[PDB]
Design a protein around this ligand. Structure first.
Ligand SMILES: O[C@@H]1CSc2nc3ccccc3n21
Ligand SMILES: O[C@@H]1CSc2nc3ccccc3n21
Ligand code: NA
Ligand code: NA
Lengths: 170, 170
């Protein structure tokens, strides 16, 4: 079932989300299924549960082909509970981000080029991966939702922030 | 004649505008007339010429009653060329701002409570005023356009940035 994606300005995007404690259950499966469905109808590459007003440490993400990032390598379809992130180097990298809770806009945002992330699949099996580049940037971005943070508070160059149909920065 | 209001992301909002040198002329009058008309149809309280892709140090502003700031005292209808601004104290004050080039959004922005501004009416007579509060905040905001600056780069508390129909911060 497709859920409403709540928009920047809602206090529910601002909360610190608690852990998921129902791994392997029917309720988590249905929620995760809703999130992939919702991500998909809105053409997202990642979606964090608080963007659907569900206060949990959960995100889904991934795709083969993105309408919005027609330049980006495939990121595996992934549902991730209780995400923890560690930078594997200090190399920062700039890239374009948008967000389904901030429709119509995009900005350039610096993120770690290399990370490891860890957590659990919805069936409870553990997940740990090294990620680089866009894959990494997705996971760091969806993680910020779980701590009540959106991309605008990460912008360093406000010349790059604007509407997607109008921007012409490189 | 109502002009297109260009949207955040256009490089033309980012420029340092040159001075107006055609005070008292027919061309400036028609431009200023267009700006009041454009401000009015979009329900603005201020409009700076670069928001209409006109690269000049010019702004119009003022109103008796605002749809968007139903709480705010009347600010006199004013067209101002070659604006210069000086804070008359260091008291900063927070208040809500939006912008016609950033439709649908608003944030809390700190501005000087007290200023003086100086420049010229379109007929060439000089203007100097002390302004406080909302009047001051309008003029400082429209001035930032003339130097290629929008309000998001002034936000200190990103919890207050969001869509106008969704926000519930105090
Ligand atoms: O603009 C898209 C739609 S959803 C999403 N999550 C993201 C994380 C990083 C970079 C881009 C995105 N986007
Ligand atoms: O949201 C409105 C529409 S235009 C404008 N210029 C401004 C300057 C300061 C505070 C608010 C505004 N606004
Ligand atoms: Na918060
Ligand atoms: Na600039």
């Amino acid at each position: 079932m497709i859920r409403d994606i709540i928009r920047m300005g809602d206090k529910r995007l601002l909360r610190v989300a608690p852990q998921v404690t129902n791994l392997g259950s029917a309720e988590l499966h249905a929620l995760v299924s809703d999130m992939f469905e919702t991500m998909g109808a809105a053409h997202g590459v990642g979606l964090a549960a608080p963007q659907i007003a569900v206060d949990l440490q959960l995100m889904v993400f991934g795709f083969e082909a993105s309408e919005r990032y027609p330049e980006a390598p495939a990121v595996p379809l992934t549902a991730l509970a209780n995400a923890q992130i560690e930078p594997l180097s200090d190399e920062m990298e700039n890239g374009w981000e948008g967000c389904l809770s901030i429709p119509g806009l995009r900005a350039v945002i610096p993120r770690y080029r290399y990370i490891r992330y860890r957590g659990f699949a919805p069936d409870g099996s553990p997940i740990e991966r090294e990620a680089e580049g866009f894959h990494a940037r997705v996971v760091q971005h969806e993680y910020d939702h779980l701590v009540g943070r959106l991309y605008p508070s990460r912008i360093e160059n406000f010349d790059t922030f604007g509407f997607d149909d109008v921007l012409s920065y490189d």
